[PDB]
Symmetry: C2
Subunit: 288 residues, 2 copies
Amino acid sequence: ITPVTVIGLGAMGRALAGALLDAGYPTTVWNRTAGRGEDLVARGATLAASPAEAVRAGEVVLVCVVDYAASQAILEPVAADLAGRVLVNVTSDSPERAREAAKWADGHGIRYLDGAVMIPTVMVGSTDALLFYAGDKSAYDEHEQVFTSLGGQSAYVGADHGLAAVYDLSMLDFFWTSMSGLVHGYALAAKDGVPATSIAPFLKAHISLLSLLIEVTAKDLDAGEYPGAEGNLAMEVEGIEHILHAAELRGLDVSVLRSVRDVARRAVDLGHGADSWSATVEGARNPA
Amino acid sequence: ITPVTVIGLGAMGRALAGALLDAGYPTTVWNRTAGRGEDLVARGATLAASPAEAVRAGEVVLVCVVDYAASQAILEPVAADLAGRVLVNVTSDSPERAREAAKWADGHGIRYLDGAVMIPTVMVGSTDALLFYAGDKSAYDEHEQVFTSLGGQSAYVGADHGLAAVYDLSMLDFFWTSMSGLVHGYALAAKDGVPATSIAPFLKAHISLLSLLIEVTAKDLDAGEYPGAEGNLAMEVEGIEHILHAAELRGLDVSVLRSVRDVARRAVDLGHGADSWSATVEGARNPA
């Protein structure tokens, strides 16, 4: 049974370690701070005396630290013990930093996978949990069931180590922009005395609509062609302006909605008024 | 049995008329420019010679004229023939416009419903389609089947006529902001060569996350209290800055992300650094 090591025992590291134990993998864990975790040891993890001892206990070493820099600082003293093992970094980092980490791993003879966790800690280890991995293909294929244990929707996205961070930041762009809109829509409703939980049941219809548009928008963006008949951007800009003005009249900050409107307007200025919302990608790509 | 009239045969007016015909209602249609209704007439709609003739043919009168001034210009000459009928304005614009239109209707003794269509035209008439209505409750109760014909999830949201626009614009605030993030996320991935249709299958994970957060966020905002168990807003603002930095480096317009960030930073400056994302509502409500 493949021995696995987890370095970094913040909440995400602890969740990863816990998923491995539920799967039945022998797990060794190490943290800079003594007080961290110890629930895992009760469930059978071995706490290691030193990062080197933790690396030596693992065929796969998972690092989940604060910053890319912190991971290099922990890892670079233990490079010698990592040689010939599999290193997976799920630390949130930029594509540039993942690729630099890949160069470092190559210089030390480490098969390296850059990973990203896309779900909250609570769902880590569940059949529907999504993680991305990029880098050494043999490392992923050899330890696929380990990675399936951390989340059943684990996906390898390619050999370029930066791609895990690319998928992560692209999905996070969508997520946090939608959470900003979610808070704003509720604030707009509250300005007229409507409780947020009165709006919430209805937002489900727009959840179903967004799921449909995910697939449609991707395929327009890949085609490079945006089709007008289902909806026209010119009229969509006018609809968004009604939101912008009502929220502004009510004293809300409207910087997000105005920014949404300007990008779409710019795509109209570039000639896409009869096209669908997908054409707004041209405003995002060619700001004035 | 109930005769229905549709005034204005743009795409939305046409979809509404088609939905009433699918349900078997006797439908009379009118447009200011000729030849809009020929497909509708072939399926049994009656074209009216004049707006006054059209109004007189329908117990329920749906007005789907996009331009406010143009719609008022048709309606005020037929005010006397609208007496004793039910007038439904299916338009977006603002709650204030609905309240103004309601005052006009009240002086003329017209029972008035302000309506908002929350789904694309192709979905109008579907059992799943969501439409909002506000205004005269006895009018809505008497013609509920006609409104259910237009969309099976038709919902009456209250007697103040402006409330349909409140629910509509609030939901649209979330929807169009999320569509902006969706295009922007796809654009970010494409700068690194990732096709949009490679990301699209994964976005389902973030959609179901959003569905849960819709309720959690609503309850926080109604409570006026935003504890964050695992995430500090201060740390969430830093995460947002890494998306912003990656997209800005790649040459994208990042207006929306910067605005999202600025509203959240304002909430930190207002004292919510230790709170959850729901506390960003304080930033939206008290811009610097």
